[PDB]
Amino acid sequence: KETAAAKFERQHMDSSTSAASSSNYCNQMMKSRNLTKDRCKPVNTFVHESLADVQAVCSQKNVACKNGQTNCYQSYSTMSITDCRETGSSKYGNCAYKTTQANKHIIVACEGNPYVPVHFDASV
Ligand SMILES: [Cl-]
Ligand SMILES: [Cl-]
């Protein structure tokens, strides 16, 4: 199986681009990151910053997670992100996504040794 740290990397990091430039960005990335394999994953967020800058959030502002756990951290500054969500016309075998680019603070859950991001909680 894939480790929790590697799964976060695969589902959420896109350091090769500064921001999404096309309305087609989500359909292409969800596919290439293998997120439309078994089913169409309903919602997913990509972060356009370096890996080192995202890992550093684990030492920033400690806050609660939506589930109540206390190993969540909010970034001190805003970051470039892209929200991907299925539209009314999406189906298994024919996934379709809406692309929304924005600049916001990110919130992640951290764990392990080294202590790194393992889950994407939300953006503000
Ligand atoms: Cl997400
Ligand atoms: Cl996640």
How does this model look, in words?
The chain is α+β, with helices and mostly antiparallel strands and 124 residues long. The chain has a single domain, classed as Ribonuclease A-like domain (P-30 Protein, Roll), CATH 3.10.130. The protein has helices at 4-12, 25-32, 51-55, and strands at residues 43-47, 61-63, 72-74, 79-86, 97-104, 106-111, 116-123. It has a four-stranded antiparallel β-sheet with strand order 2-3-6-7. It has a three-stranded antiparallel β-sheet with strand order 1-4-5, with helices on one face. The chain is globular and about 40 Å long. One chloride ion binds at residues 119-120.
What structural keywords apply?
alpha+beta, 124 residues, four-stranded antiparallel beta sheet, P-30 Protein, three-stranded antiparallel beta sheet, 18% helix, binds chloride ion, globular
Tell me the number of strands: 7
CATH topology: P-30 Protein
Write the element-wise H/E pattern from the N-terminal end onward.
HHEHEEEEEE
**β-sheet strand percentage:** 25-35%
Distance, first to last CA = 32 Å
Instruction: Supply the number of structural domains.
Output: 1
How many helices? The count is: 3
CATH architectural designation: Roll
Describe the strand arrangement of the main beta sheet, using strand numbers: 2-3-6-7
